[PDB]
Amino acid sequence: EDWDLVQTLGEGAYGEVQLAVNRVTEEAVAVKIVDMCPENIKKEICINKMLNHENVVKFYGHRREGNIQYLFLEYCSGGELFDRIEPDIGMPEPDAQRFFHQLMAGVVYLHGIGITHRDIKPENLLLDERDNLKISDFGLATVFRYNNRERLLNKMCGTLPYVAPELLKRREFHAEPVDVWSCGIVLTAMLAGELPWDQPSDSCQEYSDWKEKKTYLNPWKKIDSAPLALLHKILVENPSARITIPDIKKDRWYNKPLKKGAK
Numbered sequence: 001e002d003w004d005l006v007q008t009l010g011e012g013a014y015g016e017v018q019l020a021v022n023r024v025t026e027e028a029v030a031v032k033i034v035d036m037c038p039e040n041i042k043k044e045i046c047i048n049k050m051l052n053h054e055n056v057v058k059f060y061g062h063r064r065e066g067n068i069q070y071l072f073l074e075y076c077s078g079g080e081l082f083d084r085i086e087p088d089i090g091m092p093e094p095d096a097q098r099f100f101h102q103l104m105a106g107v108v109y110l111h112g113i114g115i116t117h118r119d120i121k122p123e124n125l126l127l128d129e130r131d132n133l134k135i136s137d138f139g140l141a142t143v144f145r146y147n148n149r150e151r152l153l154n155k156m157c158g159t160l161p162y163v164a165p166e167l168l169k170r171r172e173f174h175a176e177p178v179d180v181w182s183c184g185i186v187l188t189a190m191l192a193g194e195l196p197w198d199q200p201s202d203s204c205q206e207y208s209d210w211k212e213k214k215t216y217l218n219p220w221k222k223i224d225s226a227p228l229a230l231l232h233k234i235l236v237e238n239p240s241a242r243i244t245i246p247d248i249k250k251d252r253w254y255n256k257p258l259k260k261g262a263k
């Protein structure tokens with residue numbers, strides 16, 4: 001089945017994404033369009049074929065079509081999580097907890113099959129029709145485990161506000177703690193409506209304030225003791241002392257009843 005390109009959802013750097021609706025079955029699917037150094041897109045396709053989870057953007061197929069590559073993907077009519085975050089306020093705590101539960105479920109899945117996303121942020125977290133979170137954009141993703149053997153990462157990538165301090169300070173570093181750190185920055189953004197720092201370096205005043213436990217300053221003063229205590233465990237400088245995902249599922253705020261059922 002071939003598809004018709006109706007509208008443009010959003011032009012994201014490398015090219016554009018379009019709402020491709022078939023005119024027979026009316027099945028809606030997003031379509032990333034990248035103009036082909038084609039090791040970035042060919043790696044993205046292989047990793048996408050491995051994926052199969054409720055909190056990850058599904059990959060249906062692809063088409064070389066001469067020079068223009070067409071990644072067919074799951075359509076998410078809700079848009080980005082970025083746009084559900086009101087500046088300076090964040091969102092209701094119950095909403096933030098549900099999105100965090102779904103984010104952890106998706107990140108647990110990826111880490112279980114040996115994949116790290118490497119650029120988790122509200123802009124890459126899409127929402128479907130019933131507001132379920134789905135991790136998207138695996139163009140920076142890579143294998144950190146193969147045949148039950150971990151491999152350290154050496155490539156610096158991602159986004160500076162969301163990036164863990166060890167990838168700026170160390171030549172090599174574990175992949176999983178980096179993903180956990182960025183999930184913690186996403187949580188901060190959901191509960192405060194702002195990012196805590198430009199980068200986690202010692203040459204950044206805001207980061208140094210956080211290490212000195214000065215939680216009377218923004219954004220920490222907007223949060224609340226329960227989720228803040230979880231943030232104290234995630235945003236630990238040393239990745240070996242940093243909390244893991246199994247232990248995040250045992251956290252008090254993570255298991256606090258807050259939100260009601262379906263409407």
Ligand SMILES: OCCNc1ncnc2[nH]c(-c3ccccc3)c(-c3ccccc3)c12
Nearest residue numbers: 009010012017030074075076077079136137
């Ligand atoms: O898989 C990541 C590719 N992008 C997408 N994939 C799958 N479903 C999607 N819905 C969207 C989208 C939905 C509502 C409004 C705007 C965009 C987008 C979107 C496309 C470009 C930029 C940002 C978001 C999208």
